Amino acid sequence: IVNGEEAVPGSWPWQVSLQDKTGFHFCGGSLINENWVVTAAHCGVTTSDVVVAGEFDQGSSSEKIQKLKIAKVFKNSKYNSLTINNDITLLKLSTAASFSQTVSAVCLPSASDDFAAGTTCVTTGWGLTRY
Amino acid sequence: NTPDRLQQASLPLLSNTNCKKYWGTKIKDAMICAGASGVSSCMGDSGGPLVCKKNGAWTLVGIVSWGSSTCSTSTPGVYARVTALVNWVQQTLAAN
């Protein structure tokens, strides 16, 4: 996020990081329950990647994090790679996340829910702060 | 360019119609724009949350998807519209 600000450690408990075998963070995710993570389809997650929950400082070795194996990738059949539409993938974890003060789920809306233009929302992540 | 510590930013939701002004035909029903406010999601943010607080809790309204190749803070960021996809999510959890 460009022009963001550092979050209070553990205040976005559903925020997970998707890491490759090399420990490289390549995408964000959101816990919706102890066994499922919502992410973007274009993230191209594979069962060889790992879900990392409870992190604040990806550089710290002293945080109580949870490196969770992925049991299965569920890419929405409606996903269109060409237009990046219906960009959502579900990740079923092999072993359930242990919820804590720093690891919990985000709520999901109802299909009929209205989110009006002008509403102020928040986005979080470890993406570039400078392009 | 890449932060160690988790970043956050407040940003407004745009209407698809208004968003089409910036992105045109790239904008589909299953997409929701936010930003163009002095902040921008960027490479590595993808798949993360776009949450809105109401009646005390945070709801996933969007999923970081795409935007300006430059992460311009004056162009709206494009997120996967969760309302358009929540039915699929629920079905998927139900069946698995």
Binding site: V8, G10, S11, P13, S104, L108, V122 | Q8, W58, T59
Partner: peptide, 10 residues
């Protein structure tokens, strides 16, 4: 869901 134990500060 949706209520952080540790409240985020915007």
């Amino acid at each position: 869901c949706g209520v952080p134990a540790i409240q985020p500060v915007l």
